[PDB]
């Protein structure tokens, strides 16, 4: 049992993708998770992009957990340095058929009213009360309060290469963040037991959010674009 | 307690480094682990470079183990494609005052008639009987038979950026290998309990080796140069 897909670019109305909320595919093939009008990112925006088909991360019959690798490129342009860009984007895994959660610092994956489990890798750009300095990469399990975090310096408008890998045998989830133009490399890892937090079948995808109106700052925004995305999972059995 | 050092280049007669065997610092700031005469790598060569001062990875009094991060750049030029370049270079941690071990596939860190413990990250370029395909990154603990391995494609003569990170809390050792010219990223991780394999005080450094005479192949060689090296360790004790 080994699923696998890759998108070297995105075509309008991708039959393979499921767009939610403000997420849209631009004319030139980029996946814009958050609203951007006339080259200008907007606040009060939230969008998700899920891979249309559910993937099986573990089998209850055998007890086996899948290993997976996912690579993608993103770009975050922060047009307004003052007072503070927000909020960031995440790659996540959650039960199938979920609805967009709260925006702002919750990236659209956390729903306080009705919480669903989820594992996510965040690229946080706004410092909430529960956050260490930003920007930072964080590993989230059922909460936006990261288990592990590492700070990084964003290449404004530049391209970012990300590699997220999970080894079922060691239960190690390690992510690598590289900004090819700056030559900088950021790494973070932690132990996560998928079998323990997620159901056998899940959805994989992205979610992003810009400044929440409650913050009263229209400048709290930025773009959250995804240029490419490949995914591979291998469930032995 | 925190320790750290940085080398943006290397200077001849460096007081902070301890060179062993064939290791020498070139006129233009590169650390040549293995012998190279007039722009040509030689076989039957072995060299190590250790950081002059010992570092404390764990404290017996508190039982605490240190976390550390090390970044370095290396270059391996393989002039003779046939029959097979050899053998590779490694970054290692060992008890202080050890001497260069056997060359060839032992990289100079393993001494059969007087084994000492060690944790090492290898960049193997020659396939010994105990090796999977090469080149490959491997995590070695007391043995050249890696616990975990990952294949990679070398950028012949190109520059390679490496990031090795160890988190005491999770005991996760993760290494990242990036070839900026090719834009390729390789990642590997494993669990290693330093406190369990190493003494409180250790030496950190590099070791490399070229084809062993027993192989009767003079072309079994390559360069093993290190361009830069930074280190940082944190013992909350
Ligand atoms: C919201 O983002 C705007 C775009 O960055 C800021 O406006 C720009 O602020 C500059 C100083 O930071 C100023 O030199 C520019 O002229 C101005 N751009 C224009 C013409 O709109 C804005 O900054 C505040 O509001 C503007 C109108 C000026 O009064 C600035 O002095 C203020 O700092 C950002 N708002 C906040 C709350 O920072
Ligand atoms: C050892 O490395 C040498 C450098 O590449 C090899 O010789 C080179 O072989 C090339 C094709 O194999 C040829 O184009 C080059 O002219 C030659 N370089 C020189 C000047 O020596 C060598 O290959 C062997 O020796 C040469 C002379 C030929 O007889 C080949 O057929 C041989 O394979 C390499 N030897 C080994 C052990 O592979
Ligand atoms: C944020 O986006 C939502 C859509 O998800 C808009 O409805 C919000 O507009 C505000 O609230 C609505 C209900 C209506 O009262 C409108 O006039 C308001 O502006 C929008 N929030 C803001 C502050 O723009
Ligand atoms: C290999 O090197 C050692 C010492 O560096 C030397 O004594 C020996 O003669 C060399 N062997 C060959 C065949 O070059
Ligand atoms: O002003 C922006 C700011 O608004 C609120 O404080 C949200 O909780 C933050 O995450 C951020 O969106
Ligand atoms: O020919 C080169 C080859 O020689 C022997 O087999 C060594 O054990 C190897 O590590 C390598 O040096
Ligand atoms: Ca935040
Ligand atoms: Ca080998
Ligand atoms: Mn955060
Ligand atoms: Mn090996």
Swiss-Prot record, chains A, B:
<feature type="glycosylation site" description="N-linked (GlcNAc...) asparagine">
    <location>
        <position position="44"/>
    </location>
</feature>
<dbReference type="InterPro" id="IPR013320">
    <property type="entry name" value="ConA-like_dom_sf"/>
</dbReference>
<dbReference type="Pfam" id="PF00139">
    <property type="entry name" value="Lectin_legB"/>
</dbReference>
<dbReference type="InterPro" id="IPR001220">
    <property type="entry name" value="Legume_lectin_dom"/>
</dbReference>
<keyword id="KW-0430">Lectin</keyword>
<protein>
    <recommendedName>
        <fullName>Basic agglutinin</fullName>
    </recommendedName>
</protein>
<dbReference type="InterPro" id="IPR050258">
    <property type="entry name" value="Leguminous_Lectin"/>
</dbReference>
<comment type="function">
    <text>Lectin.</text>
</comment>
<dbReference type="GO" id="GO:0030246">
    <property type="term" value="F:carbohydrate binding"/>
</dbReference>
<keyword id="KW-0325">Glycoprotein</keyword>
<dbReference type="InterPro" id="IPR016363">
    <property type="entry name" value="L-lectin"/>
</dbReference>
<comment type="similarity">
    <text>Belongs to the leguminous lectin family.</text>
</comment>
<feature type="glycosylation site" description="N-linked (GlcNAc...) asparagine">
    <location>
        <position position="219"/>
    </location>
</feature>
<dbReference type="InterPro" id="IPR019825">
    <property type="entry name" value="Lectin_legB_Mn/Ca_BS"/>
</dbReference>
């Amino acid at each position: 049992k080994t699923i696998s897909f890759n998108f070297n670019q995105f075509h309008q109305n991708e039959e393979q993708l499921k767009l939610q909320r403000d997420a849209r595919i631009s004319s030139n093939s980029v996946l814009e998770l958050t609203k951007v009008v006339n080259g200008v990112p907007t606040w009060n925006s939230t969008g998700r992009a899920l891979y249309a088909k559910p993937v099986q991360v573990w089998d209850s019959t055998t007890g086996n957990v899948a290993s997976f690798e996912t690579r993608f490129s993103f770009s975050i342009r922060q047009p307004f340095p003052r007072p503070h860009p927000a909020d960031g984007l995440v790659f996540f895994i959650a039960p199938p058929n979920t609805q967009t959660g709260e925006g702002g610092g919750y990236f659209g994956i956390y729903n306080p009213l009705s919480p669903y489990p989820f594992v996510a890798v965040e690229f946080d750009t706004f410092r909430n009360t529960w956050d260490p300095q930003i920007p930072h990469i964080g590993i989230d399990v059922n909460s936006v309060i990261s288990t592990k975090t590492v700070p990084f310096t964003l290449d404004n408008g530049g391209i970012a290469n990300v590699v997220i890998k999970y080894d079922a045998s060691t239960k190690i989830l390690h992510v690598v963040l590289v900004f090819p133009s700056l030559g900088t490399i950021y790494t973070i890892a932690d132990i996560v037991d998928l079998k323990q937090v997620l159901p056998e079948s899940v959805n994989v995808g992205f979610s992003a959010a810009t400044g929440d109106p409650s913050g009263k700052q229209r400048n709290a925004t930025e773009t959250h674009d995804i240029l490419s995305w490949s995914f591979s999972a291998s469930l032995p059995g």
